[PDB]
Amino acid sequence: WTVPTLNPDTPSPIFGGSTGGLLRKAQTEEFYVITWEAKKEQIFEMPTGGAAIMRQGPNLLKFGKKEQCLALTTQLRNKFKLTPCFYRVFPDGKVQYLHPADGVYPEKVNAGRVGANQNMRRIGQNVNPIKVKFSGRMMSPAEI
Amino acid sequence: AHIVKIYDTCIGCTQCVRACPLDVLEMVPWDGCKASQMASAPRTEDCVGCKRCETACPTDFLSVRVYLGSESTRSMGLSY
Amino acid sequence: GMLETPVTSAPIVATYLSNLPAYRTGVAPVLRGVEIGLAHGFLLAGPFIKLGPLRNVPETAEIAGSLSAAGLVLILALCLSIYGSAQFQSARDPLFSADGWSEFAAGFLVGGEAGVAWAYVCTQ
Amino acid sequence: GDFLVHHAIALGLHTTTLILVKGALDARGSKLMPDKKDFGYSFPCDGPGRGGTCDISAYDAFYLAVFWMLNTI
Amino acid sequence: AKKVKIAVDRNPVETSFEKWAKPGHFSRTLSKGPNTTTWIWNLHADAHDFDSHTSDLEEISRKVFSAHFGQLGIIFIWLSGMYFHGARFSNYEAWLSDPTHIKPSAQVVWPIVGQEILNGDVGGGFQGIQITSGFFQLWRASGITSELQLYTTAIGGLVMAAAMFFAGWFHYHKAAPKLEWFQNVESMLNHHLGGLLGLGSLAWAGHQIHVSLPVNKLLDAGVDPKEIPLPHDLLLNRAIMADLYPSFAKGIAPFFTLNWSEYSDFLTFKGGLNPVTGGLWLSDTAHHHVAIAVLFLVAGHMYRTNWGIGHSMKEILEAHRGPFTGEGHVGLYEILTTSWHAQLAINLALFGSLSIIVAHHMYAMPPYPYLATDYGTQLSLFTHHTWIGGFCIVGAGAHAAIFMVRDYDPTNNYNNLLDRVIRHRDAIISHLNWVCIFLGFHSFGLYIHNDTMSALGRPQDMFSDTAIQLQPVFAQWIQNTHFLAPQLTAPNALAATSLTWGGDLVAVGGKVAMMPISLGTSDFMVHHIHAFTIHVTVLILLKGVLFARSSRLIPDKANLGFRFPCDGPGRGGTCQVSAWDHVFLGLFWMYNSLSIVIFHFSWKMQSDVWGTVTASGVSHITGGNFAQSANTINGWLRDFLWAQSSQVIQSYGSALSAYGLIFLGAHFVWAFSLMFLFSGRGYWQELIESIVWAHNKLKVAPAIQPRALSITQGRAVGVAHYLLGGIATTWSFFLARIISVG
Amino acid sequence: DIAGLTPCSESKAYAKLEKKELKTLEKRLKQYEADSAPAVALKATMERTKARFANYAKAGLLCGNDGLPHLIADPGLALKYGHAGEVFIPTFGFLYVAGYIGYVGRQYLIAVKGEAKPTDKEIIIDVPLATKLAWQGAGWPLAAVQELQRGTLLEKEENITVSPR
Amino acid sequence: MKDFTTYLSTAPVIATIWFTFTAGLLIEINRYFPDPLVFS
Ligand code: CLA
Ligand code: CLA
Ligand code: CLA
Ligand code: CLA
Ligand code: CLA
Ligand code: CLA
Ligand SMILES: CC1=C(C/C=C(\C)CCC[C@H](C)CCC[C@H](C)CCCC(C)C)C(=O)c2ccccc2C1=O
Ligand code: SF4
Ligand code: SF4
Ligand code: SF4
């Protein structure tokens, strides 16, 4: 498996538009693109409101925040048995592939993943806040 | 960004990963539990702090914990 | 993606907006403020003259109403000045720049005060 | 008449103390939130899980107590 | 084409007490029994949520149909009780002889712990609680003259109540209709228009022509009630009727020969009010109900059932499409024949709106004899029916949202009206948001302006009739048009529909029945407060409906359901995002709006309409102080609340002392509710832990684990006690005030 | 007398209060006929009122300047001056009934915790078991002391859950 | 009949009966011993 490359030419689902879509943040900060392959034309629900028709084959939609792309991913995966992926697109044209991060969806354990933010103790074994006082900022005993 | 930590009481049931609406968590190989897998939090810059993961955790007390931290556009969930 | 309506996208509407001094690029920012200042300064005297605390006084009403409108123009000019200081700290249209907005604010003050004065002349 | 109102005042003092004392003594933790001390004095809540945890922080106990202090005074 | 026909299932459900002894049987979650106290609350919250217990639409429909027979059975018991208490525990017979000087009463309290003081001296040699429901005036209008007639109606009500409860059992356990039976919307409308409404109106017109009119004609002539012929004598003896109405000497021939002008003696178009009773002419109501019957019997032949002729409702909807609205009304027929919540949303909205119209039309055009001069009944009826309408309208918002989350399906709604409304919801809500701010500033801000100018000693700077004026010229113009209608635009009407338009007052028993209502600056200001409060209530409710399924904040709100507390402290905090929470907030604003509506009605009627009539003229209850005082907040606090609360807070030791007690009791319940609205369960659960420790220490800990209320229940408890306390406070305040000075 | 109070039987305000209350009823009684039901009801209220003022004075209640009975709560003053029936005796009446209710409920709770499904016996009451316990609760003061002396009334600290500290 | 008597043993029904009985006892005592303020 290798990181896919976004194709901006991909056609988008049939949709008449709405007032729930992108704002000035997309022009200045970042936006998100989700793509998937559809087996047939089918009506699905937009996370921004309304019904859209996915074209047979490649599809492409743009969203304002990451949660919107993953919300549609959950719908497509569970209700239609599809395998979408999405990216983060910066105003200068840079594209950052996001999901699934390593080609395998996170709920399925995969080799080569390195644990992060794992504490080798129980919650009840955290130290008292007095022991981390005056550490340079506000920090919980769970941060050590 | 919020702070998400996984503790060694995890049973590797995967329910926190399935419940995360932001894809912050994932399952990695482990040897400390029967399932031989542990939850991980590699992408905490995207955590919004909803705590759906904590709601899904079966262990007592929790094995996944969210500590709300500094607020950015991503953590605040803004689309503008 | 976005919802297009006759109000949002129409030929008559679009042409009218482009003619307004706010959207008329290629014009010096100071001139933009003066034209915008004159329009707003003239109308502002109305409500103060006809509904102020001295409205019923025969001749003092015109002076007090226009004089109060002039004070509101000064406050508005100060609001423009600080807005430019905050918004522009670090492009195509010179108006949206630190130097351009300052000139635009200055024009609004001169135009606004003149508009108030012109309104007073019309009354008397 | 003075008898009845003096017991109203005692009701106010004891209830205000109950809220403030409960807030202080549970500030570090409870059966509902065993690790509360890891979250600090003031924080929103711990989310809808475990039945729902609105106003669980010691700061919120003080917030509730002020209403009773005003009623008592 | 499917034939419209009866279709049932034989013996679908066995009649047994087995499930009565198994609480929670109806739900898969609760049927296993309690482990915590939350189970107990969940049992009751889910009891009638039929569609959450099953997905079979037929099973849901049958439960709905039999639940409705249960409701009707209860209403018949309630009605039977009212008639019975009128027959056995009232002064109705005495009241009939002297309606102006006797107070209606139909409740008598037992003498115990000193409570018999509540049996006041209401007149007619009787002691009891004075009623304000207006049943006495309704009974007189229908021609009832004896306790025997009231008693017989009460018996018949119980027989009907038993029949309703039998029908509910029969149509759920014995012969339950199939889903196709329920979906005959064309046939249902034909029967409910032509049959329920058309025949019902025709039948009632029959009672009015043959019983109400003859009896009320003799009552208004001073004839003693016991000397009036019994109703069956009027029915069997045409000669007696012909004496009262000569046209009866010609029988029904004029009706069949189209000589309808012969019946002008009992089918009239007088308008105005009967000067003896102060109510509408009964000959006008009889012609009204005849005309209504014909209209609804015609309406009941519009829809196609089984004989080709008629309209297909689906064909009508699909034909009405235009350039601006995509597919238009396509798919609405399917929604409205498969979702009960969609049907309930429309029906509650209009039934509630209808209730508010009834409140206005009955005060202005009092339909019952001696209703207008019973100020206690007039104030009560208007307030009661206004509140029902407000509550019903909020329920419309709730069940529109429930349809949005549970029953809405995108595949069936593509580019139609419903789909297109969702796709510009930000445009709808953003504009409605602006209107509310504009209305709030320019309506309540005017009062704040007036309070400040008055406090600064500049009355000449106030918005008032003697200062800067805000005349409701449009409303004034409409009044003039309606007052002059009989001359030009209603040539055959003797008088205008109502005396509120203009003209001369009607006095009954030395008191004003109705008179013209003038509209000044104060009336202009309060009407734009009403506009403000309604628009905000709509904003809260409409927002909940349009964002029930998703928003920019929570992209997948639909998966979280109709009723959930939040989606966590993240995203800055998402408390009360669910549609249910919008109904929760909408209730408060509905309460705030309708409180001002009824305060407007109460003060305006006392100040400018109600009063005593003597040689010197009309002296109103509050002496016409609404015009100059109602334009400041301090005016409402002083001249309305402080001044008119004198009766209720001084009622101890009198028959009205029960209103004094409830006045304080309602203040208590209102304040008690703030405990639930301001706090959170996390605090209470931790408190319960310490109390549980004490019970554990003494080996008296319950097996069902105590739990603090759920987040959503805490809100439901808070609003329920808020509304009950707030409404019951004004209820006591109104009744003590009006029963004393009325 | 105690705390400056005076006996109600010797209080002018107390006597005046009774006259006002009867005077209010007498005024209402004028508008009704002798045999009519309202007249009978009003006279019955008047008889109860006269008996009430007679009984309270007979019981020896102390009246304030307002003419209203005032209760005495200190056991010493109550027993010394014959006011024990105001607060002191009622005190032990309540505590007997209240403990009766509490003790019976506790017995039922303990009895059903040995069943297969204890929570089912808390929403569907075992009426035969509840009835038996209700009758035996008349001796709770004796039973409660024996448990206190036997060390079985209270549970041991090692079996009670607590939060971290 | 077993099931019906089981239904009558549910908490709301028992509470209704018990409080109806308790209220009746308190009301009837005040009917025969009116206006009791002290014990004599
Ligand atoms: C004696 C006859 C009888 C019997 C033995 C049954 C038995 C059964 N019915 Mg049937 N039913 C009957 C009469 C009967 N029904 C009648 C008269 C109707 C018409 C209303 C119905 C309508 C009906 C429906 C629509 C349903 C049942 C269902 C059931 C089952 C569960 C019942 C349950 O849990 O009740 C316990 C419930 C109660 C005790 C609530 C009683 C509610 C009534 C209307 C009185 C409320 C009045 C009260 C004063 C309201 C205000 C309270 C306030 C004052 C505090 C069970 C097989 C349910 C089922 O699952 O069937 C398979 C079901 O869905 N029945
Ligand atoms: C002319 C025929 C007719 C009449 C008079 C009614 C009357 C009524 N229907 Mg409708 N209905 C009809 C035909 C009719 N229906 C047909 C043909 C269908 C199938 C398409 C339906 C399907 C239907 C449903 C699904 C429901 C109703 C309901 C109602 C009630 C609404 C509440 C109300 O206004 O109470 C006013 C109350 C009265 C005026 C009391 C009238 C009582 C007498 C007994 C007449 C009842 C009508 C009945 C058809 C008579 C014969 C019944 C049987 C012995 C043959 C009302 C009693 C609702 C309801 O509450 O049901 C319980 C409801 O849920 N109806
Ligand atoms: C539904 C409403 C209604 C009803 C029920 C009635 C009823 C009546 N009206 Mg009224 N009326 C109404 C509306 C109504 N009216 C309206 C709207 C108007 C205004 C236009 C009038 C204007 C009016 C006038 C001007 C007169 C009446 C009269 C009458 C009476 C005689 C009618 C007649 O000649 O019938 C003719 C025949 C029939 C109606 C058919 C009867 C069929 C029977 C019941 C069949 C029974 C068969 C069965 C097998 C028998 C078994 C027996 C058993 C023992 C074995 C009657 C009591 C007359 C009267 O005398 O009033 C006092 C009269 O003069 N009405
Ligand atoms: C025709 C009228 C109607 C009907 C048939 C329904 C039916 C339904 N509604 Mg809807 N609703 C209505 C009107 C109606 N509603 C109105 C007017 C409102 C606005 C207030 C709402 C607001 C509303 C909400 C917000 C919700 C529903 C829900 C429901 C469902 C479950 C109800 C339940 O289990 O209650 C069980 C009944 C109770 C727990 C009893 C409640 C008693 C209240 C709180 C207090 C009553 C006080 C009393 C009148 C006076 C004081 C008495 C006291 C002193 C003893 C059901 C489909 C629920 C749902 O999820 O539907 C899908 C839901 O969440 N409704
Ligand atoms: C008296 C109490 C109060 C007040 C003043 C408000 C005010 C408001 N509420 Mg709120 N609300 C209240 C109680 C109150 N609420 C309660 C108890 C609840 C819980 C149920 C809510 C729940 C609630 C909801 C759910 C919503 C509102 C909405 C609104 C807004 C309506 C639009 C409007 O009129 O804007 C104009 C503001 C006013 C009329 C308030 C007074 C303005 C004064 C007179 C102006 C003074 C100007 C002056 C220059 C001040 C200078 C000061 C200084 C700097 C020198 C407004 C901000 C709605 C909203 O946001 O609509 C857009 C809305 O959705 N409220
Ligand atoms: C709640 C607290 C409280 C308070 C403030 C009082 C206050 C009082 N009690 Mg009371 N008393 C109480 C509870 C209380 N008592 C209880 C619970 C009991 C039952 C055990 C009694 C039994 C009791 C008796 C038997 C007598 C009093 C007496 C008195 C009065 C004078 C004695 C004294 O100094 O008492 C101050 C109180 C205390 C320091 C607390 C302990 C008091 C003990 C129990 C009684 C002491 C009596 C004293 C030695 C008598 C001296 C001679 C006397 C003629 C002055 C005084 C007003 C005396 C009195 O005036 O009777 C008419 C008296 O004879 N009390
Ligand atoms: C006061 C309060 C509580 C505590 C309230 C509770 C636990 C409800 C108490 C209900 C009754 C009184 C307890 C159960 C009663 C039983 C049915 C037994 C009754 C016995 C009699 C018949 C004798 C909350 O749980 C809560 C939750 C969320 C927001 C606000 C609040 C809140 O304000
Ligand atoms: S708090 Fe929410 S976004 Fe963050 S890891 Fe947990 S479930 Fe995911
Ligand atoms: S839900 Fe809890 S136990 Fe399961 S994988 Fe996540 S952290 Fe581990
Ligand atoms: S509703 Fe309660 S639990 Fe949910 S976010 Fe708000 S405070 Fe936290």
Residue numbers in the entry:
A (entry chain D): 53 to 196
B (entry chain C): 2 to 81
C (entry chain L): 53 to 142, 157 to 190
D (entry chain B): 516 to 588
E (entry chain A): 10 to 751
F (entry chain F): 63 to 227
G (entry chain J): 1 to 40
What does the study report here?
The remaining 74,209 particles containing the monomer were refined to 2.31 Å resolution, representing a considerable improvement on the previously reported maps. In our PSI monomer reconstruction, the resolution in the core is ~2.1 Å, and in the LHCI inner belt 2.1–2.5 Å, revealing additional structural details of chlorophylls, carotenoids and 621 water molecules. The quality of the data aided in improving the previous models in functionally important regions. This includes the identification of nine Chl b molecules, two newly modelled luteins, a β-carotene and more accurate estimation of the coordination of 53 chlorophylls. Particularly, Chl b molecules are identified at positions 601 and 606 in Lhca4, Lhca5, Lhca6, Lhca7 and Lhca8. The two newly modelled luteins 720 and 626 are in the N-terminus of Lhca3 next to Chl a 614, and in Lhca5 next to Chl a 617, respectively. Another striking feature of the high-resolution cryo-EM map is resolvable density for multiple newly detected water molecules, which particularly aided in modelling the coordination of chlorophylls. Remarkably, water molecules play a coordinative role for most of Chl b, for which the relative ratio of water coordination is four times higher than for Chl a. The difference between Chl a and Chl b is a methyl versus a formyl group; thus, water serves as a hydrogen bond donor to the latter, while it also interacts with charged/polar protein residues or lipids. Therefore, the immediate surrounding of Chl b molecules is more enriched with non-protein material than previously thought, which plays a role in tuning the photophysics and the transport properties of excitation energy in PSI.
Photosystem I (PSI) enables photo-electron transfer and regulates photosynthesis in the bioenergetic membranes of cyanobacteria and chloroplasts. Being a multi-subunit complex, its macromolecular organization affects the dynamics of photosynthetic membranes. A chloroplast photosystem I (PSI) of green algae consists of a core complex and three antenna modules: inner belt, outer belt and Lhca2-Lhca9 heterodimer, which together comprise 24 subunits.
